[model samples]
Target: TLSILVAHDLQRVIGFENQLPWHLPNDLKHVKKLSTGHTLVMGRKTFESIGKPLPNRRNVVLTSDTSFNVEGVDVIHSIEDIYQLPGHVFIFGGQTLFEEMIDKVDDMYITVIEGKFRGDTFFPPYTFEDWEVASSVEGKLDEKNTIPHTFLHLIRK
Candidate 1:
């Protein structure tokens, strides 16, 4: 099954000039665990944000432009290529990629911030009719400038 993971705003914003601000250590660990022995699919910009290839996982970056290339990362041009990858696949995204994959995703790992933010990218609207919350965890940062956040595991209903 394919899982889509992201942190977004009420307006569905997922990025601000190409980035996410909230720091969810637990969520990142969860992602690392889930992606272990599996594959991760993301856009070129998402890969760029990481600065390098993620260790212990197959990183696949999707891009329409064939000229784009990154060492040690598999590059594909379509979502279908991602589906063809071995093992479980996680689609981590910027706004456009998330919106495109929302309806096709089977599961999602989302982190909802307690406070609002200013951003240029956003997630698509969630339809309660098509999804149901499977589980959630409320977390807070430790003595840092982090606010409480909710981690939700959603499954298609």
Candidate 2:
């Protein structure tokens, strides 16, 4: 049950600089809840952006550099080795990790935020030709946050 948990803007921007682009309260909450108590596979830079290991989850970091270190996080060298671990795993990313896992994803959970944005990093292009939406829920924009977003659940055919 490998899945992807990603947030992207209308223009396919997934990051600004090396950080998550926006401050959407509900989206953060959504991310918090979904990854809680699950195994997360993230790259070194993504882990650095997070600053620390995520609470309530097992953090497995894939990096070529063995020198990468974070207390309480399992820093590993290869994706192939990480795959040997047990149970449902989720690929959490900045960009490179997503690109590497692109064709191997089983399910995709994307937060489609409103508005086009400027960013150095963008989500990898993916076509829906082999995918179908399992579900989607519309979101409302309020003082909580200006941008409206949609929660999309997509599954590969």
Question: Per-prediction count of colliding residue pairs?
Answer: 6, 0
Predictions in order: lDDT: 0.80, 0.85
lDDT of 2 by residue, 33-95 (tens): 788888899988888898899888899999989677778898878767756866778888879
List pairs with backbone clashes in candidate 1: 12-122, 12-123, 13-121, 13-122, 14-121, 14-122
- Which ranges of candidate 1 are over 4 A from the true structure? none
Tens-digit lDDT string for candidate 1 (63-124): 99899777878899987887788777888897768878988889998877766788777788
Q: Pick out the ten consecutive residues of candidate 2 with the lowest summed lDDT.
A: 79-88
Residue 77 in candidate 2, Cα distance off native in Å? 0.9
Cα shift from native, residue 46, model 2 (Å): 0.9
Best by TM-score: 2
